[PDB]
Amino acid sequence: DGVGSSSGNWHCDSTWLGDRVITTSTRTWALPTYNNHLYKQISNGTSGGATNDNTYFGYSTPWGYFDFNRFHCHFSPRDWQRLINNNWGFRPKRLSFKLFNIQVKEVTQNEGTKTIANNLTSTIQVFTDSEYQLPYVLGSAHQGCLPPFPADVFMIPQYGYLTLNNGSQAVGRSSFYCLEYFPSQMLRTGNNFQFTYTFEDVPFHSSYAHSQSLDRLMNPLIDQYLYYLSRTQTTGGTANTQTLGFSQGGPNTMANQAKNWLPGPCYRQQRVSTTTGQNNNSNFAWTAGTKYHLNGRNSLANPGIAMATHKDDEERFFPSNGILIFGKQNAARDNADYSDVMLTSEEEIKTTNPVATEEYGIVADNLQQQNTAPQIGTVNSQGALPGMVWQNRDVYLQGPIWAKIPHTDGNFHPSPLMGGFGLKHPPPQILIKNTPVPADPPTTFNQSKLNSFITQYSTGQVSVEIEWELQKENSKRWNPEIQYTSNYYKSTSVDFAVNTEGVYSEPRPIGTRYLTRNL
Amino acid sequence: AHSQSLDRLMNPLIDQYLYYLSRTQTTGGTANTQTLGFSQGGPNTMANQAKNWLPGPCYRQQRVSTTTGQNNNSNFAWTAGTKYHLNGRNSLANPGIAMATHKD
Amino acid sequence: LMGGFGLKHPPPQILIKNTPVPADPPTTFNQSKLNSFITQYSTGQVSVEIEWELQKENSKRWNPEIQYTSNYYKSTSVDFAVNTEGVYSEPRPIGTRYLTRNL
Numbered sequence: 001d002g003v004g005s006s007s008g009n010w011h012c013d014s015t016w017l018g019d020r021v022i023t024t025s026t027r028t029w030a031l032p033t034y035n036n037h038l039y040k041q042i043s044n045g046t047s048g049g050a051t052n053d054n055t056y057f058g059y060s061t062p063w064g065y066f067d068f069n070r071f072h073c074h075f076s077p078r079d080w081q082r083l084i085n086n087n088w089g090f091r092p093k094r095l096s097f098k099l100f101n102i103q104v105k106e107v108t109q110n111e112g113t114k115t116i117a118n119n120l121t122s123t124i125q126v127f128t129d130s131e132y133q134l135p136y137v138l139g140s141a142h143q144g145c146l147p148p149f150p151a152d153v154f155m156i157p158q159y160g161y162l163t164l165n166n167g168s169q170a171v172g173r174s175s176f177y178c179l180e181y182f183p184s185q186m187l188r189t190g191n192n193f194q195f196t197y198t199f200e201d202v203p204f205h206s207s208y209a210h211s212q213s214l215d216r217l218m219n220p221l222i223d224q225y226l227y228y229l230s231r232t233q234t235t236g237g238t239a240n241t242q243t244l245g246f247s248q249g250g251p252n253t254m255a256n257q258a259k260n261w262l263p264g265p266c267y268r269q270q271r272v273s274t275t276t277g278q279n280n281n282s283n284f285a286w287t288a289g290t291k292y293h294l295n296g297r298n299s300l301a302n303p304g305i306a307m308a309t310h311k312d313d314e315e316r317f318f319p320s321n322g323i324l325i326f327g328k329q330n331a332a333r334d335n336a337d338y339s340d341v342m343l344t345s346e347e348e349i350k351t352t353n354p355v356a357t358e359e360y361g362i363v364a365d366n367l368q369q370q371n372t373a374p375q376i377g378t379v380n381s382q383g384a385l386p387g388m389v390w391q392n393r394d395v396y397l398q399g400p401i402w403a404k405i406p407h408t409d410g411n412f413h414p415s416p417l418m419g420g421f422g423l424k425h426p427p428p429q430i431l432i433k434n435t436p437v438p439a440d441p442p443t444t445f446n447q448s449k450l451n452s453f454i455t456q457y458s459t460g461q462v463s464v465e466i467e468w469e470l471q472k473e474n475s476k477r478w479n480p481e482i483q484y485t486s487n488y489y490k491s492t493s494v495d496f497a498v499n500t501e502g503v504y505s506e507p508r509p510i511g512t513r514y515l516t517r518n519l
Numbered sequence: 520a521h522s523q524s525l526d527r528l529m530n531p532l533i534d535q536y537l538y539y540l541s542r543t544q545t546t547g548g549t550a551n552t553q554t555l556g557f558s559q560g561g562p563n564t565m566a567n568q569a570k571n572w573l574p575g576p577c578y579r580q581q582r583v584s585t586t587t588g589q590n591n592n593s594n595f596a597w598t599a600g601t602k603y604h605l606n607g608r609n610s611l612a613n614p615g616i617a618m619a620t621h622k623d
Numbered sequence: 624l625m626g627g628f629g630l631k632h633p634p635p636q637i638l639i640k641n642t643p644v645p646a647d648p649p650t651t652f653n654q655s656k657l658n659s660f661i662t663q664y665s666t667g668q669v670s671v672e673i674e675w676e677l678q679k680e681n682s683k684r685w686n687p688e689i690q691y692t693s694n695y696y697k698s699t700s701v702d703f704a705v706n707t708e709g710v711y712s713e714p715r716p717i718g719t720r721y722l723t724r725n726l
């Protein structure tokens with residue numbers, strides 16, 4: 001381990017071995033000094049115009065962190081295509097992480113003149129929250145992950161966290177965490193860091209779409225032996241009185257047939273069209289938003305439980321806050337136009353999951369008698385019911401991979417709503433920080449903590465290797481399947497490539513459900 | 520006791536890469552018509568941020584204050600009680616599912 | 624067609640690049656890829672050793688053969704050498720077909 005010796009090589013590749021695929025990606029990173037080496041209490045109350053739904057109390061820290069919770073951090077577009085076009089499923093098995101070729105640079109600023117040089121003896125500090133003692137900030141769809149394109153140099157995100165709050169104030173249970181309290185490895189140029197991790201057992205992601213629907217599992221050609229109430233009143237003319245008539249469900253009465261299952265849970269969202277002219281002329285994104293109520297404040301149930309984005313022929317419709325939406329390259333942070341973002345679609349699950357913008361179904365609302373007509377009620381919120389079956393939200397090339405399951409007494413189907421794998425012991429948080437280097441101190445002793453430091457930052461490479469287990473497709477479907485494919489005809493540029501300006505871009509969201517499977 | 524809340528698990532300092540519908544109508548004056556505007560959740564919009572979880576189940580109970588003067592003047596302990604209906608008879612869902620006794 | 628040996632598995636391409644070294648980054652996080660780098664270049668030596676197999680000549684031709692030869696008489700400079708300015712130059716193209724062979 002010396003100044004003149006590399007401490008690691010560039011490992012970027014993918015190998016397919018059978019029921020496994022191993023991805024490996026390396027990137028060059030840059031880490032500045034955050035918070036001026038300080039920890040700062042940050043808060044936001046209800047003063048000014050800040051609403052109560054957005055209050056918070058927490059801290060910003062001088063630390064940065066590595067994040068690769070995004071599929072494109074590991075799969076190239078072509079690899080993603082190889083995965084989704086041929087496998088009914090897949091899942092993470094184990095990973096290796098490495099930090100190397102570290103270099104700490106210090107910048108001198110005198111008379112407009114700026115010079116940067118190495119500080120051969122400075123160190124960075126690194127450690128993993130292997131015992132999950134820090135607030136788990138990963139799994140919240142934050143920016144700062146390794147770039148999709150291998151040639152892009154990225155900046156390391158700053159670590160910050162939240163605790164309990166009451167307005168802009170802290171409460172008795174509010175917790176303060178000092179990351180310097182943890183043992184951490186100190187590396188100088190020449191030193192490297194690495195660790196291994198094994199994923200817990202988790203189900204394969206459903207990278208397939210159903211080629212059958214819950215309400216169409218019977219034999220088209222045979223009647224049931226079971227009967228259903230088919231008539232409640234006579235029909236012979238005008239002397240119509242009450243009676244009781246029963247019939248057997250059959251090919252023409254599939255909606256009446258007795259069935260064994262029920263569609264998945266529902267939490268109805270407001271519908272909105274991509275054809276603005278068809279929408280009400282008001283600003284309802286928030287006022288008509290589907291939300292949950294937690295201790296006084298409201299949050300969008302975004303994207304909320306997995307529901308079909310729209311029913312047959314209505315591609316223009318989508319749940320106001322019930323789908324993942326990515327931005328196109330350079331889309332504005334605020335009020336970006338529809339043509340600057342990319343809406344995803346969980347259309348593939350219409351097959352088992354209720355459509356996100358409609359009722360779950362209908363229930364009786366009273367007791368009918370001869371003097372009281374029967375009444376019905378529309379169900380727009382339907383929790384788990386015995387016999388329900390459903391699918392989870394799909395995952396995307398540019399979407400999240402996993403999330404830490406909250407440590408609670410209970411929960412229900414812990415599949416992270418934004419999509420992905422829910423893990424009790426997810427990949428550990430990897431914290432990194434440039435060690436503060438005092439600028440000359442006074443010549444006579446003083447109690448005060450130093451606050452004058454040499455200006456510096458660090459850079460180096462990072463590698464992440466993940467082994468994935470594949471669940472091969474075993475279909476007897478005779479006719480060809482749907483497959484993700486590149487466009488055929490000429491185009492100004494190549495999809496999933498760089499610009500004349502060297503800018504890489506992801507033209508569209510790529511899901512995972514192309515192959516089909518029976519129910 | 521948890522020292523964090525379900526709706527405050529993100530990093531206070533970083534924006535999401537995910538967007539949410541932020542605007543449905545223009546704002547420039549009185550010619551306001553429908554439009555579509557999207558934004559990225561961030562430190563000041565934590566209520567809008569995409570999240571992975573939902574709060575536990577609910578079965579709303581009637582509230583009552585220990586300051587009698589703030590309560591309706593009637594005997595509602597039973598009539599306004601949260602109950603379940605089993606074969607013709609009703610029982611108080613007491614104490615029922617676990618829910619926070621009160622907010623801040 | 625330009626001449627030479629056609630190979631299905633020719634010597635591999637050898638790619639080289641200077642690793643980008645970020646110039647100081649901003650002090651508060653930003654999504655954008657860095658675009659400010661320290662200006663640098665690299666230098667070093669490179670060696671290539673190739674072993675060639677020769678097919679010796681086995682001719683019974685009685686009379687001398689044609690041979691590539693340096694010019695005999697005086698000249699301003701030496702062919703295949705440097706200038707008074709230190710510039711090396713190849714005065715002419717030199718082929719390979721001097722010895723002869725029957726059909």
Ligand code: NA
Pocket residue numbers: 485486487495496
């Ligand atoms: Na493509």
Ligand code: NA
Pocket residue numbers: 692693694702703
């Ligand atoms: Na010569």
